[PDB]
Amino acid sequence: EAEKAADESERGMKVIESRAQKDEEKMEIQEIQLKEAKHIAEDADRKYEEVARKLVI
Amino acid sequence: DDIYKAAVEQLTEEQKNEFKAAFDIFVLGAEDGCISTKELGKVMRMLGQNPTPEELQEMIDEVDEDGSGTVDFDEFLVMMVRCMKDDSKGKSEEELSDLFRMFDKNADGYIDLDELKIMLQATGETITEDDIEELMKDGDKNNDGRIDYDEFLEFMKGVE
Numbered sequence: 155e156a157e158k159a160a161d162e163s164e165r166g167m168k169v170i171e172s173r174a175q176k177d178e179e180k181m182e183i184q185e186i187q188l189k190e191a192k193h194i195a196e197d198a199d200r201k202y203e204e205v206a207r208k209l210v211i
Numbered sequence: 212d213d214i215y216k217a218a219v220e221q222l223t224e225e226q227k228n229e230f231k232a233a234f235d236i237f238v239l240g241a242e243d244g245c246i247s248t249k250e251l252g253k254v255m256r257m258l259g260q261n262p263t264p265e266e267l268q269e270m271i272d273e274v275d276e277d278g279s280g281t282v283d284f285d286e287f288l289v290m291m292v293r294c295m296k297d298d299s300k301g302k303s304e305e306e307l308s309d310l311f312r313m314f315d316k317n318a319d320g321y322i323d324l325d326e327l328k329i330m331l332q333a334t335g336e337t338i339t340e341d342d343i344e345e346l347m348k349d350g351d352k353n354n355d356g357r358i359d360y361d362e363f364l365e366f367m368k369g370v371e
Contacts, residue, residue, distance in 0.1 A: 200264045207265055 215285045218292035221369060223300065230291055231284070233257060245281045248274060260295070270294065298369030311360045321357035 234254055237246040251274070252267055262270070274282045274290050282290075292298075314322040314330065327346070328338055336342075350358045350366045358366070 200268060203265050204268075 214289055218289040221298055221371070222288070222292050227288060227291070230288075234287065243281075245283065248280065248282060251282065255294075258295075296369065299371050302367075302369055302371075304364065307364065308360060311363050314358070314363070321359050322363070323357065327358070 234246075236254065236257070237250055238244055248271055251271075252262070255262060270290065270293075273293065274286050276286075311322075314326060316326055316329075317323070324343075328343065331342065331346075332338060346366075350362050352362075
């Protein structure tokens, strides 16, 4: 019983460890995408505001 | 060019001395001594103003015409002179009204174009066309044919 439990826990070890590492990879991907999205949002804000000032003129 | 010395003349000594000694807040050591354009916005926060993306990006466009990605000290002085518009620590107006009296030499209430032409040639420069034409565009808005004390004040704002 103890041996089978230990082996089951080993299988769990590897499964969950991999899950966590994958999550970290996803974290990095999401981070760079969020930075790009924020840059694009600031760009669009600036563009719209400049157009609005020209419009007011 | 004449913009560099005009910026020198239109700004007081204490302001520009503090401006330069305070621009020296970014330099720390082993640097070129000229900071990147975007860092300029940060020194402005020190100045006490809170500019905005439109003015910031425009002003950014007002430096580094030749496209080096960096700002020199003469462009630095011209942009600063072009930023705060409170020149001469508040231009006066009373003596200026005396000077309004000066522009008029027939005692009518306003400035004639002939009086402007003689006033301009009295400096030493003759009449050219772009001179008076641009001076009229700066001074007038609706072709009223004269420069009154409002347009008088407006045209030379900040000038000493």
